[PDB]
Amino acid sequence: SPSDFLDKLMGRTSGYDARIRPNFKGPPVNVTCNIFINSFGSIAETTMDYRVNIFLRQKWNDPRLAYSEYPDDSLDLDPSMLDSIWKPDLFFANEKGANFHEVTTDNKLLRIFKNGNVLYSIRLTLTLSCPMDLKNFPMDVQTCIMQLESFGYTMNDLIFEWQDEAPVQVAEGLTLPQFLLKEEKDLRYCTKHYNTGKFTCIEVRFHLERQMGYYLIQMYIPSLLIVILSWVSFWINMDAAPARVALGITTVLTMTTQSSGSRASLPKVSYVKAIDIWMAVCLLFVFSALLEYAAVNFVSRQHKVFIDRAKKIDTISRACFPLAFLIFNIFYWVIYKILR
Amino acid sequence: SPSDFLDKLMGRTSGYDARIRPNFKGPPVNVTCNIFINSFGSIAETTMDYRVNIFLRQKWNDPRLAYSEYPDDSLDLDPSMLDSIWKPDLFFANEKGANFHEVTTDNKLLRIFKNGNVLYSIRLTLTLSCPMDLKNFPMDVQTCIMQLESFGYTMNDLIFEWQDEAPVQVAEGLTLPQFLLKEEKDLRYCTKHYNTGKFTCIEVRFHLERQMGYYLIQMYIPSLLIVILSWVSFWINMDAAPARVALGITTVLTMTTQSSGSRASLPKVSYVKAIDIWMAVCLLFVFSALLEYAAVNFVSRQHKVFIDRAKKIDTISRACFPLAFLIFNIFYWVIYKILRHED
Amino acid sequence: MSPSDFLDKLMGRTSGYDARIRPNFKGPPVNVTCNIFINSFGSIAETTMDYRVNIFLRQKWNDPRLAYSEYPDDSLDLDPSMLDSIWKPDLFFANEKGANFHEVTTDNKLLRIFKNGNVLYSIRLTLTLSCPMDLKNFPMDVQTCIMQLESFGYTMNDLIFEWQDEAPVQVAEGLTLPQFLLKEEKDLRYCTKHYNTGKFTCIEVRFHLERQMGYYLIQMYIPSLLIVILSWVSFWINMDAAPARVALGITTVLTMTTQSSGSRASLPKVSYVKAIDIWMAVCLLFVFSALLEYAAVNFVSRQKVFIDRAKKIDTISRACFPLAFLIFNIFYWVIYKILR
Amino acid sequence: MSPSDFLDKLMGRTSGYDARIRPNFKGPPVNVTCNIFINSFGSIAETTMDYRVNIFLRQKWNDPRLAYSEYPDDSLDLDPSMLDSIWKPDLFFANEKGANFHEVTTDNKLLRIFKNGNVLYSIRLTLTLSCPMDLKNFPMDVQTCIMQLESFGYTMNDLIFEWQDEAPVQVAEGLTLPQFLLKEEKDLRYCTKHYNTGKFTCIEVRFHLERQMGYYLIQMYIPSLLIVILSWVSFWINMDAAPARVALGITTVLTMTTQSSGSRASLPKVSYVKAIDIWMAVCLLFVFSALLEYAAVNFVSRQKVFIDRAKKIDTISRACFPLAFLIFNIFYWVIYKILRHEDI
Amino acid sequence: VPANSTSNILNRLLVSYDPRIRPNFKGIPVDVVVNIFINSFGSIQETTMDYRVNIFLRQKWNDPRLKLPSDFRGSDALTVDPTMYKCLWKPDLFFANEKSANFHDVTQENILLFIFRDGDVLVSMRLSITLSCPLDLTLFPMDTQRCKMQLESFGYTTDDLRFIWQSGDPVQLEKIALPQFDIKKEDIEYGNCTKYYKGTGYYTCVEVIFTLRRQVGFYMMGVYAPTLLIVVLSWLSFWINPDASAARVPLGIFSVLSLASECTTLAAELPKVSYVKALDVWLIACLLFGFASLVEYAVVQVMLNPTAAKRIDLYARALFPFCFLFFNVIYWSIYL
Numbered sequence A: 001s002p003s004d005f006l007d008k009l010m011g012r013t014s015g016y017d018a019r020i021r022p023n024f025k026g027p028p029v030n031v032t033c034n035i036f037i038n039s040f041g042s043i044a045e046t047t048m049d050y051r052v053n054i055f056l057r058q059k060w061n062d063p064r065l066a067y068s069e070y071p072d073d074s075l076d077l078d079p080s081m082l083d084s085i086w087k088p089d090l091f092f093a094n095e096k097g098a099n100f101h102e103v104t105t106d107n108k109l110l111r112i113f114k115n116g117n118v119l120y121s122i123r124l125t126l127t128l129s130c131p132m133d134l135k136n137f138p139m140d141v142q143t144c145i146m147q148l149e150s151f152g153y154t155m156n157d158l159i160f161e162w163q164d165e166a167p168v169q170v171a172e173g174l175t176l177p178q179f180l181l182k183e184e185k186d187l188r189y190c191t192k193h194y195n196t197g198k199f200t201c202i203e204v205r206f207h208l209e210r211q212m213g214y215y216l217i218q219m220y221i222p223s224l225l226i227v228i229l230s231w232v233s234f235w236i237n238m239d240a241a242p243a244r245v246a247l248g249i250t251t252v253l254t255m256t257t258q259s260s261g262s263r264a265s266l267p268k269v270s271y272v273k274a275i276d277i278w279m280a281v282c283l284l285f286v287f288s289a290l291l292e293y294a295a296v297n298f299v300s301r302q303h304k305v306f307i308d309r310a311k312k313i314d315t316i317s318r319a320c321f322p323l324a325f326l327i328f329n330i331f332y333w334v335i336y337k338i339l340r
Numbered sequence B: 001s002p003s004d005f006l007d008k009l010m011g012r013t014s015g016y017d018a019r020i021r022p023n024f025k026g027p028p029v030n031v032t033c034n035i036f037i038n039s040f041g042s043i044a045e046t047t048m049d050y051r052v053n054i055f056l057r058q059k060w061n062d063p064r065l066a067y068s069e070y071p072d073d074s075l076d077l078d079p080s081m082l083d084s085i086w087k088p089d090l091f092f093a094n095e096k097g098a099n100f101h102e103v104t105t106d107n108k109l110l111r112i113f114k115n116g117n118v119l120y121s122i123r124l125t126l127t128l129s130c131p132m133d134l135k136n137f138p139m140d141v142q143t144c145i146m147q148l149e150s151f152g153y154t155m156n157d158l159i160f161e162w163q164d165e166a167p168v169q170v171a172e173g174l175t176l177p178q179f180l181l182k183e184e185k186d187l188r189y190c191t192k193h194y195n196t197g198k199f200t201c202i203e204v205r206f207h208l209e210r211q212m213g214y215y216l217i218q219m220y221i222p223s224l225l226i227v228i229l230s231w232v233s234f235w236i237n238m239d240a241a242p243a244r245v246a247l248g249i250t251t252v253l254t255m256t257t258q259s260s261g262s263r264a265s266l267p268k269v270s271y272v273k274a275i276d277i278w279m280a281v282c283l284l285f286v287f288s289a290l291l292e293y294a295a296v297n298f299v300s301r302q303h304k305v306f307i308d309r310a311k312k313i314d315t316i317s318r319a320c321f322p323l324a325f326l327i328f329n330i331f332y333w334v335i336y337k338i339l340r341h342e343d
Numbered sequence C: 001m002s003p004s005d006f007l008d009k010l011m012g013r014t015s016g017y018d019a020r021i022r023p024n025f026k027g028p029p030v031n032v033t034c035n036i037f038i039n040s041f042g043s044i045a046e047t048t049m050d051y052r053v054n055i056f057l058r059q060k061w062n063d064p065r066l067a068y069s070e071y072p073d074d075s076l077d078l079d080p081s082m083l084d085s086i087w088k089p090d091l092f093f094a095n096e097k098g099a100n101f102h103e104v105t106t107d108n109k110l111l112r113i114f115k116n117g118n119v120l121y122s123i124r125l126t127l128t129l130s131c132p133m134d135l136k137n138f139p140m141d142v143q144t145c146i147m148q149l150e151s152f153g154y155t156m157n158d159l160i161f162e163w164q165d166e167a168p169v170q171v172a173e174g175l176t177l178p179q180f181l182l183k184e185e186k187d188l189r190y191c192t193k194h195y196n197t198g199k200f201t202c203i204e205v206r207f208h209l210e211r212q213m214g215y216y217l218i219q220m221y222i223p224s225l226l227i228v229i230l231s232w233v234s235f236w237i238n239m240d241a242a243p244a245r246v247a248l249g250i251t252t253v254l255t256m257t258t259q260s261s262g263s264r265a266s267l268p269k270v271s272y273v274k275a276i277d278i279w280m281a282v283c284l285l286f287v288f289s290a291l292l293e294y295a296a297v298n299f300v301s302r303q304k305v306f307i308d309r310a311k312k313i314d315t316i317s318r319a320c321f322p323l324a325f326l327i328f329n330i331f332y333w334v335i336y337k338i339l340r
Numbered sequence D: 001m002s003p004s005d006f007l008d009k010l011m012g013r014t015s016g017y018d019a020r021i022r023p024n025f026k027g028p029p030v031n032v033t034c035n036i037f038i039n040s041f042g043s044i045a046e047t048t049m050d051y052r053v054n055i056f057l058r059q060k061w062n063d064p065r066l067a068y069s070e071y072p073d074d075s076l077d078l079d080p081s082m083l084d085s086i087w088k089p090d091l092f093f094a095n096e097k098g099a100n101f102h103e104v105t106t107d108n109k110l111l112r113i114f115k116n117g118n119v120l121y122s123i124r125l126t127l128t129l130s131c132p133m134d135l136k137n138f139p140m141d142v143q144t145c146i147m148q149l150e151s152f153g154y155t156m157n158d159l160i161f162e163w164q165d166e167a168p169v170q171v172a173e174g175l176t177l178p179q180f181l182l183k184e185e186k187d188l189r190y191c192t193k194h195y196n197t198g199k200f201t202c203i204e205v206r207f208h209l210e211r212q213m214g215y216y217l218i219q220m221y222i223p224s225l226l227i228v229i230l231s232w233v234s235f236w237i238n239m240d241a242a243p244a245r246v247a248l249g250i251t252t253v254l255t256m257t258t259q260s261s262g263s264r265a266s267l268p269k270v271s272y273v274k275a276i277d278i279w280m281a282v283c284l285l286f287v288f289s290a291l292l293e294y295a296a297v298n299f300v301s302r303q304k305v306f307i308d309r310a311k312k313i314d315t316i317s318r319a320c321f322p323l324a325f326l327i328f329n330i331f332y333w334v335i336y337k338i339l340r341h342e343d344i
Numbered sequence E: 001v002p003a004n005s006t007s008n009i010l011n012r013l014l015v016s017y018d019p020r021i022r023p024n025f026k027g028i029p030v031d032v033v034v035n036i037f038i039n040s041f042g043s044i045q046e047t048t049m050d051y052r053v054n055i056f057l058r059q060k061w062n063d064p065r066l067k068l069p070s071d072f073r074g075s076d077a078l079t080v081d082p083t084m085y086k087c088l089w090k091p092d093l094f095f096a097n098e099k100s101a102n103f104h105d106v107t108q109e110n111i112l113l114f115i116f117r118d119g120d121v122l123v124s125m126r127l128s129i130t131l132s133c134p135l136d137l138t139l140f141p142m143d144t145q146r147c148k149m150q151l152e153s154f155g156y157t158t159d160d161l162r163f164i165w166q167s168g169d170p171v172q173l174e175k176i177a178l179p180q181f182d183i184k185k186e187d188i189e190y191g192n193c194t195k196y197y198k199g200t201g202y203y204t205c206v207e208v209i210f211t212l213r214r215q216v217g218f219y220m221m222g223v224y225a226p227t228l229l230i231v232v233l234s235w236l237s238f239w240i241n242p243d244a245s246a247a248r249v250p251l252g253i254f255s256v257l258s259l260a261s262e263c264t265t266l267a268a269e270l271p272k273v274s275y276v277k278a279l280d281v282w283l284i285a286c287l288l289f290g291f292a293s294l295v296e297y298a299v300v301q302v303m304l305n306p307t308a309a310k311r312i313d314l315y316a317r318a319l320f321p322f323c324f325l326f327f328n329v330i331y332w333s334i335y336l
């Protein structure tokens, strides 16, 4: 009878207790864990965190769960049976909040093989934490870290290892709202050392590169259009003061609005970001155009060859400013696209 | 005695244990499940998720719950009895987070028939997730998904099937806050494959299309008003330079701040949306009007015989700009209403 | 002797040890030595006056009922679930809005029993502490937030807390704050709170936090300097050329009043006046004073012998405003960097 | 002799004590004397009409079933976990939007059983109470937020609540509010709510709160004074500078409208008018009247023999408006500071 | 007889009382009498279309298995400790239009249990439910919302459980005050719905329908004084001499931009709906009036390039107030 078999295996009549690890006071019991990412996203720069949804899996061997009644090896058990067997401690080192998932039942899997190997996969939702470097914001590449670590036992009893083949796999059809996922994911050892003792640890790296497709349209194109519009004043004659003062204040006001929005869209940071550099340079160029207007107006109104000097300086400015803008633009783009 | 009947069926003296599925290591037990949408809404673009309130129902047959004491077949039991019988595992795959409803009791139903069939309906509240495309944001059509999938058992032990008739039914009088719900609901099979095994799965599709009335009133009318305000400056005489420059400045400022406000309330996406195109064209037209005023001022101040040129260019611009706006309007509306979508 | 039998005899059903009575029942008070481990730190918000930590609280105490002799080894590790059967000292944080344990894939607790009876008990926690702040000089303020560990159930006659002798508070290497900086010294005081019901022990730790100027400088102060320089530019221009000066006044006023609006919004409402408020008010006053000076110059010029007066007052203003602004800046910076 | 044996004989399995029957059953109602201890305060949000507290609620009562004689001492301290085995009085806060216990490393509870049967039971709590507010004079308002204690399971025939004779409500030393001030006096009274199911005991404590105007003064009154002072500049400007006066009036009206709209966006919707609303409306009315007066003077001027009339009306306005504004200022401030509002 | 012996022998595992079987099993359906005491009301978030109440739900029925001893003449009221509430049969009851509801528990559980002489059992619980009602915003500033609350049964069909309201004054409330709404204590009309679910059967449900009418005291000021002042300011441009040609245009442009800003700002509070609200109608009409003033100035300027211009200006200045008064009269007549 299957109920009698279950009772004899792990029930009260079995004599098996879950308060003792396998091969107590001997070699450390090793666990080979691999995950399966089901979802991703919600990467927020303000809080420096992201949410995953993983089917964490673990495997270990104990000699106390060996059976011979059933010839079949891969035996499936109910999720509710997991409360009566030993389970290795495992907590994520860097996480702000995590919780199980239970709808219409608990989300757990249990499977016992003939030789004693046990498979235990549990669904989880995590909110991990990864500090980010925003030195070059619109063209940054992030590496967010997920760490697995034992808590109850030292390295003398519990050891974690990745699976040799396909340790981390991504669900098909997954896409990120604003980032990209690299096809390679680094795996390393951490082995954190605390005051109490030596605890095992396990780390997996995710490489994310931001796509500037939105930032182009939102900021760079309007800035280019505004700074190009600012140059129309040079071709306008100096006597048309209302026209030039019209093509004045407007571009600096628009640049101020763009700078305010771009700077207010991001979290606080000590250093200066690339978008800040671009916005500052464009604002300075608009200010320089207005200052050139003021200088031409001041020289022209020097109450006899003065008009010729004003024409010469206006022509020089109209011929020089595009070259300066082009050289700044090419230098900025090449450095932040190659040498960054 | 009914208490003795319950004890003999699934009680202490029954011998029944809820730890073994029906037909152990035999044919896989099939489950026919259907839902009943009781609420809908909160479809938010900034998070790409929506909330439902379903009366999930499951039906299956196990031979160990067959009784003969009661002549009647349809027997109703307490919700608290559900923990003494076997139940199939079922989790929603694309779920950000869901919780039961426990008010004054557990919201559960149980019904055991004579032949052994079991009905088990439980009230839930799901925050599902559906990725969206925003190629044409104000006039888009979205398809959000709900997936049912087994976790504990492979396809060799548990199989899910939709009901033959009326698989998904909606409560009468349901209204969406902004969207509209179609009368067609596709039913497919997913049957997800993992390395552990081949798990059964079940899918359902909801079709939603967006109503543009709110977006129309909130954004398209003010943009038209602002561009007409910009055009008003054409007929003002060029001698009154301050009057025209004030309009040229204020219309540009209003247009750019309105564009920023309109675009600040949407998720950041790589592609370009329809509202972005409309805002860009309106801003470009305002800028072109200001540039035309600058040009007509420049022409007039060249110095007799030039005032005629300024008047002719001003009249040509005033007679030409509205036609360009109208042709752009008809082109954009037809291309985004006929061929691009709803085709 | 099977380990299960040993655990049953030590603190199990047949042991006779009950967790309902503290060691040395109404004898000498039991002393507890506690030390912590800050795993993560941050989320300092002035709008709510709170901050979040993530500590590995550890406690040590001695009881004679948990002394064993069967196992020769001294450091014996037990399961986290075994902690519900031993006496645990009460410990609640006095100043905290909300705290919760971490329970992912198991309970996050540790237990270890030595031969002489010493017990180690480390439990992971996440806390949202509370510390009121002083914003007299907001951009250059120094904050001291307080974490208190206090007993609740027992009086001073039964439970006594005290910090560990050597290295009581340790911080994980590589920890960084999003906006603040951590001092290398941390005070360790005593509270010893007195209540109506009795005399309760308490333990206090001080963290020194100092805000950085890296962000605020670039975001606020430098643009104000550039705005005031732009305002000064107009004075050096000839008076007859009205439109250039009018444009330089309008753009200056508009940009400064656009920038000054958002500075005060993010901070909470307080009675006192902050440094950023003073700086913004003074800069706005200088810009308005420049505009009023230009208006007065135009008014005087709109009344031979008068143009000389207009030009001399214009050059007097142009030579006087830089001196006033520089003396204001030196006074402000010196007072708020030395005396305050 | 052993403490475990004593505990089991007092309230254990062999004790015969059942926690489902109140002391002296079918007799006089058991009296419970309670006092609180405020540990934190603040988070007074007007948009939601609530405030958060943090109290060490304490309850004292006597039952003859917990009298001991083995231990000579009178005061005895027990584990917090023992509180699930003895009778406890029901107590809920009627005006509560939500409250939760505090558990960290253990439950936050205290138990103390005296020789004669008196029991002390102090439990830590965090409450989000609700108090309606009147905003007739918003920047100079005085608010009274209420905390109520009430029995639920038993009527006044079984349970009676009373305040403590001395030190009923205690405040932690150095407690500060972010914006308000806490008065020394705290009123205590009875409520004794009556329902159709019976007559329930109740207990009420009042806190007196008065707002500080230091922030609101700087934020609102100073810019309004600057705006109204700059409005008077138009009158002294010559009529020939009509566009300048038009622009100054328009920008002053714009500033007043923006400030008035911003002021009301930070408060909950209310049918009646507030003091700040009256101030903003009157300042906007003064600016609008100044602009209208300028328009009327300009209309008069553009109809010799009339320029003198325009000058005299402009001077009359320039001499009368500051006086009227100062009279309104003193009248409004004295009426909203001394008698018509505040001052108890 | 021991004091606890009454509760021990009346209902416990020792006695033959099974809480898993409804009273009158396979017989007459159980009748439940329900009345509600409203404790708090408010937090009507128009953006989420939900409101939060706080009620003292009460329900009584007849349970023949719970009869007090005949010799026990200890009055009808037999207040039982709330802990023993889990040892007797309870009727299922869930709120159909509920989004999030939870119990309250501070220092104890908030539940009161009564057992009368003949067997009637009274249960009163303190709940904090968050109901939902679909708002109708056809005339937003002066609407009359109709938000309801429908109780229901889940476990048992109409053959076993049936809900009936209290005979006299079922819904009670003491001086409930709301920030923006006024709830009539008399218009609490209620009926019963007995919803039918296909595939399972009938299920009883009783509903209470309130009547909330928004009071226009805040919207009136905040969105009709500034707009009226802006319109009058725009009218003020007519009396300015046309020769200025530079001061009248700023008045019109300021009027239209201020009205546009007001219209944009005032739409953030309300939820997104397809139809057109009365407030939007008023804002659109005011914006159109301002734009008409500006375009009439443009027409005057065109005609000036002055007797005809003066005649046009006088005609417009005479015409506009009458047309605006007519519009205001008809608008306030439609939306009285």
Ligand SMILES: *[C@@H]1O[C@H](CO)[C@@H](O)[C@H](O)[C@H]1NC(C)=O
Pocket: A023, A027, A028, A029, A030, A031, A061, A159
């Ligand atoms: C588990 O892996 C460790 C790794 O060092 C090894 O020493 C140990 O023997 C393995 N297995 C067991 C059952 O201890």
Ligand SMILES: *[C@@H]1O[C@H](CO)[C@@H](O)[C@H](O)[C@H]1NC(C)=O
Pocket: B023, B027, B028, B029, B030, B061, B159
């Ligand atoms: C359930 O459906 C499956 C579908 O293949 C069928 O094989 C099976 O026999 C059915 N019934 C049972 C009781 O297993």
Ligand SMILES: *[C@@H]1O[C@H](CO)[C@@H](O)[C@H](O)[C@H]1NC(C)=O
Pocket: C024, C028, C029, C030, C031, C062, C160
């Ligand atoms: C714990 O330390 C205190 C410090 O005063 C001491 O009195 C006491 O004896 C120590 N230990 C025990 C087991 O009581």
Ligand SMILES: *[C@@H]1O[C@H](CO)[C@@H](O)[C@H](O)[C@H]1NC(C)=O
Pocket: D024, D028, D029, D030, D031, D160
């Ligand atoms: C408790 O106080 C009440 C107050 O009236 C009194 O009647 C009663 O006797 C007191 N004591 C007991 C044990 O009931």
Ligand SMILES: *[C@@H]1O[C@H](CO)[C@@H](O)[C@H](O)[C@H]1NC(C)=O
Pocket: E163, E164, E165, E192, E193, E194
């Ligand atoms: C509920 O309405 C149904 C309508 O079929 C009716 O049969 C039933 O008696 C009603 N109950 C009450 C209490 O009004």
